[PDB]
């Protein structure tokens with residue numbers, strides 16, 4: 001059941017493609033989003049840019065903000081401030097040789113770099129837990145595997161490679177043979193975590209990247225209610241960056257609506273950002289109590 | 295040792311630095327003003343360059359009371375001694391930006407710092423290429439190597455200076471710049487530099503086919519009453535890419551030559567971290583330097599490669 005859909009327009013980036021966004025967030029009575037900005041015919045040449053919402057389905061580069069030399073930007077609120085992250089790619093003579101999540105904290109126009117995750121780990125996401133501890137999802141996929149970890153820290157400055165690498169494995173069984181992990185994590189009223197996730201399947205081969213969700217219990221490390229909630233075909237049509245990404249959606253996360261439905265934001269085809277209007281995916285596990293109101 | 299127990303191995307550069315401060319000829323000086331960065335400090339700039347009929351500089355932008363919180367921003371020249379952040383340009387999450395022209399395009403670099411729980415854990419040079427408003431990231435140097443600089447040689451090859459000790463090697467094409475190439479560079483004749491650390495900021499091709507290097511050389515100065523100073527002087531030398539020989543090594547600038555400015559911390563009271571030179575119509579040069587990790591100035595000096603040829607490289611993009 002899809003109740004609506006749109007592709008976002010992004011002004012102020014010279015017609016470049018904008019995709020794999022953060023969720024939208026608010027600051028000083030405006031709405032913002034971070035976008036991954038890249039030329040359609042260029043690969044691994046992304047920057048992350050802060051955009052201000054200026055109209056229905058329309059954002060414009062905010063000229064005051066610095067830009068970040070990162071792919072796949074994401075935001076969360078921890079202890080009353082923004083934590084911003086993205087992938088920082090290292091190349092060796094034009095070839096990708098490493099990639100690591102970089103983390104910034106502060107206010108949206110005043111972000112300060114404070115840590116990187118481990119070498120070759122992309123899928124790190126944070127959330128504030130009901131008791132005020134910080135939850136960390138990790139993704140182990142450097143050794144052929146594709147496993148999700150979870151750990152906690154007290155303070156964002158404690159986010160270290162050692163903490164991330166030591167995260168206890170979650171019950172990954174429900175995910176089947178999917179690679180990926182959360183894009184956005186929500187605290188629910190139950191104290192459980194609602195995860196909006198990206199899972200890729202190779203289907204004997206078709207490359208599928210699907211919008212998924214699951215509920216996680218920080219007390220037991222159990223995963224519940226794993227499901228698909230979006231595919232690229234749900235969004236308005238758009239030619240993918242190359243034909244091999246014709247069924248690739250890289251989820252951004254959800255935004256609750258007054259009516260109790262939500263906007264599911266996703267990168268699509270590595271060329272655009274859209275949303276589909278869907279039913280609340282964590283129905284029966286509590287309402288979202290986290291926000292990104294800065 | 296002339297410092298006795300204060301330092302039993304005084305850097306051999308100390309007499310050169312004091313002698314330069316007695317004998318220097320300075321024809322003018324200024325501190326640059328930067329608009330559009332919310333009062334933040336701007337320092338350790340690239341040299342100025344031209345593009346599309348305007349003048350630009352990259353600056354390292356950091357709050358005076360913040361440490362290891364830099365971004366590199368493209369500034370457009372507004373007036374004499376005055377630049378403003380260019381709003382169209384992206385920013386780079388780098389320290390100590392530097393530019394050079396290779397094979398008709400800009401090569402842009404800076405230091406990318408990695409932290410682990412707020413503490414510096416790694417740093418490496420990142421390199422971009424293209425046009426000034428359209429730079430594309432293509433390589434990083436080795437872990438913990440800051441002092442890598444490029445130049446286009448007389449024969450069209452690319453010269454690479456490395457800092458382990460200063461090294462030199464060549465490649466054909468900028469996409470060949472790899473950790474493996476950088477780490478395999480042969481050592482240069484270190485005799486004149488001695489036990490002073492640092493390396494080139496900016497390299498120029500001269501009409502002689504030699505390289506003019508504008509360099510940063512430093513040492514630690516223990517003071518009887520004061521704290522330990524991190525001394526950085528502006529230096530120059532001429533390099534022969536065929537023999538790895540160094541000629542005409544000298545001091546060409548020190549912090550005290552520039553207009554006064556309170557350093558970021560007291561230990562940087564004699565720190566001038568050079569950016570490089572810009573030729574003037576009158577045959578003198580503007581020597582641009584970061585000063586005190588708080589500002590960018592220039593001093594007007596004699597051409598430091600006098601007698602080794604005219605600069606034939608450019609940064610006219």
Ligand SMILES: OC[C@H]1O[C@@H](O)[C@@H](O)[C@@H](O)[C@@H]1O
Nearest residue numbers: 338389390524565567584587
């Ligand atoms: O702090 C003094 C100088 O030290 C050097 O090693 C570099 O880190 C420069 O960026 C700095 O200006």
Ligand SMILES: OC[C@H]1O[C@H](O)[C@@H](O)[C@@H](O)[C@@H]1O
Nearest residue numbers: 043044045071087089096099
């Ligand atoms: O992170 C480096 C590189 O890795 C993968 O190939 C994809 O996620 C690309 O979008 C990205 O540019």
Ligand SMILES: OC[C@H]1O[C@H](O)[C@@H](O)[C@@H](O)[C@@H]1O
Nearest residue numbers: 008009010016017018271272
């Ligand atoms: O598909 C359309 C979409 O493509 C790119 O992502 C950008 O140029 C957007 O501004 C535009 O709306």
Ligand SMILES: OC[C@H]1O[C@H](O)[C@@H](O)[C@@H](O)[C@@H]1O
Nearest residue numbers: 326327328334335336588589
């Ligand atoms: O005052 C010295 C210098 O300090 C900082 O680098 C900036 O505020 C500059 O604009 C200023 O000129």
